[PDB]
Design a protein around this ligand. Structure first.
Ligand SMILES: Cc1cc2nc3c(=O)[nH]c(=O)nc-3n(C[C@H](O)[C@H](O)[C@H](O)COP(=O)(O)OP(=O)(O)OC[C@H]3O[C@@H](n4cnc5c(N)ncnc54)[C@H](O)[C@@H]3O)c2cc1C
Ligand SMILES: CC(C)=CCc1ccc2c(C[C@H](N)C(=O)O)c[nH]c2c1
Length: 426
């Protein structure tokens, strides 16, 4: 009745928890046959951005919900099945599954002229039902449209093997004995390359823009938990980058003696990739670094340095696009295509609509999603109020110009936040 929550992954569950605490009536619609979001997919063989060898890269204590710790048997970085099991247990413990419509996919959300929203949902049969809700919380994630590079290098149609996105990547054993190129230096790319490196005969890592390769751990500490080490917070920006970047050099050297492009910036500049493996896999010959792909010559891949390589498959680890197909008008955006959401959550001109989890932070997203859920629940029942619309887009303006200044007009900087000052206002 009162709130329709689109999604029962980690964000939609935090939302149902927050709605349930205030006694707010809500239903939670979710396409998958179970709660869990992306983490439930690798274990069910479903096209999703995860893969059979995916673990957390955030500390479990900063990753689980604050009122519901993960089993103490869990390691610091649990596997995706452990994470998916944990999230099923939360929904159980929180009495949410009575409110979750599984196998229910939202197809349109439209704001009626009188205030409420008509939500059309496709049930398990495909039977479309059309319902009305006072408010809609969107928690559908932003990793659900693959982003393939344009242009795909020449000869793509000549190619004897398979070209695929990480979305379609599933397990390294699906390429045992083959020769595979991985394109990208993202979190998906180093993980997939390291996985392939123990199954494919040969694994090539084709990277064209250098990213910073930071281990999951410095001084025995997770880097997401160093982020709030009080001794680290009293650092100035180039005081910590001073120590962070010398921390890297003793731990690993710099990227330039692994055959890796080093980046056009220092750390924290655009993004850093977290790995424990990829540098050592290079140094054991299990992964060979390569520049950008230049063309597909039929059976081989040609890289821009002139070198060539026989290749049975290319997995594009190039990330995801941010879309909302159930929203005819789109997520609020500026013409630059930057997200326009007051405090990263609230459209300035659309009462009753809220976006949760549509942020990308230093470290784990859970505390932020909890903060967002708690605020939204108090907006839904009037304990909290919003500024007038002109004032809301003033804060969006300040956020955005500061975004173009710091991270630049890259793709996806419109949702970038630092855990600390963001949580600090909830
Ligand atoms: C490979 C990978 C690794 C990551 N690792 C970490 C990590 O270690 N630590 C961390 O803190 N974060 C990590 N993240 C970030 C990750 O997004 C969050 O941890 C978490 O998954 C957020 O879940 P969510 O609920 O926001 O979205 P999702 O997990 O995407 O869940 C959204 C849900 O919406 C559902 N849905 C229902 N109806 C619809 C509909 N009509 N249209 C669309 N969707 C619908 C989808 O089925 C899906 O279950 C990782 C992300 C990726 C891709
Ligand atoms: C150098 C340094 C201390 C960086 C701090 C840091 C940055 C990013 C992450 C992530 C990515 C996460 N998967 C996300 O994008 O939400 C997990 N832990 C992190 C820690």
């Amino acid at each position: 009745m009162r709130v329709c929550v689109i999604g029962a992954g980690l964000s939609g569950l935090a939302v149902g928890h927050a709605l349930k605490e205030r006694g707010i009536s809500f239903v939670c619609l979710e396409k998958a046959p179970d709660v869990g979001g992306i983490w439930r997919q690798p274990g069910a063989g479903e096209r999703g951005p995860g893969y059979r060898t995916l673990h957390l890269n955030t500390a479990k204590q900063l990753t689980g919900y604050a009122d519901f710790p993960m089993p103490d048997a869990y390691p610091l970085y649990p596997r995706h099945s452990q994470v998916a099991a944990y999230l099923r247990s939360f929904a159980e413990w929180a009495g949410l599954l009575d409110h979750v419509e599984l196998r229910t996919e939202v197809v349109s959300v439209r704001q009626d002229a009188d205030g409420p929203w008509t939500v059309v949902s496709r049930g398990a049969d495909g039977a479309q039902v059309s319902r009305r809700f006072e408010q809609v919380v969107v928690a559908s994630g932003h990793h659900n449209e693959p982003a393939l590079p344009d242009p795909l290098p020449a000869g793509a149609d000549s190619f004897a093997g398979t070209i695929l996105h990480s979305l379609d990547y599933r397990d390294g054993g699906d390429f045992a004995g083959r020769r595979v190129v991985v394109v990208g230096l993202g979190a998906s790319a180093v993980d997939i390359a390291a996985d392939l490196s123990r199954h494919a005969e040969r694994t090539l890592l084709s990277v064209r823009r250098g990213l910073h390769i930071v281990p999951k751990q410095l001084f025995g500490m997770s880097v997401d938990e160093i982020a709030e080490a009080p001794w680290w917070n009293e650092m100035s920006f180039d005081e910590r980058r001073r120590w962070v970047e010398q921390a890297l050099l003793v731990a690993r050297g710099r990227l330039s003696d692994y055959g890796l492009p080093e980046p056009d910036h220092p750390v924290f500049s655009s993004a850093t990739t977290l790995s424990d493996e990829i540098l050592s896999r290079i140094r054991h010959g299990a992964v060979t670094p390569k520049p950008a792909i230049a063309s597909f010559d039929g059976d081989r891949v040609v890289f821009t340095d002139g070198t060539s390589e026989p290749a049975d498959a290319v997995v594009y680890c190039t990330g995801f696009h941010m879309t909302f197909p159930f929203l005819p008008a789109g997520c609020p955006m500026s013409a630059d295509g930057s997200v326009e959401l007051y405090r990263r959550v609230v459209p300035a001109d659309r009462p009753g609509l809220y976006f949760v989890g549509l942020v990308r932070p230093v470290g784990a997203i859970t505390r932020l999603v909890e903060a967002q859920a708690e605020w939204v629940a108090r907006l839904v029942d009037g304990a909290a109020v919003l500024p007038a619309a002109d004032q809301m887009r003033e804060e969006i303006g300040t956020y955005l110009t500061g975004i173009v200044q710091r991270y630049g007009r890259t793709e996806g900087a419109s949702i970038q936040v630092d855990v600390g000052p963001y949580l600090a206002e909830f």
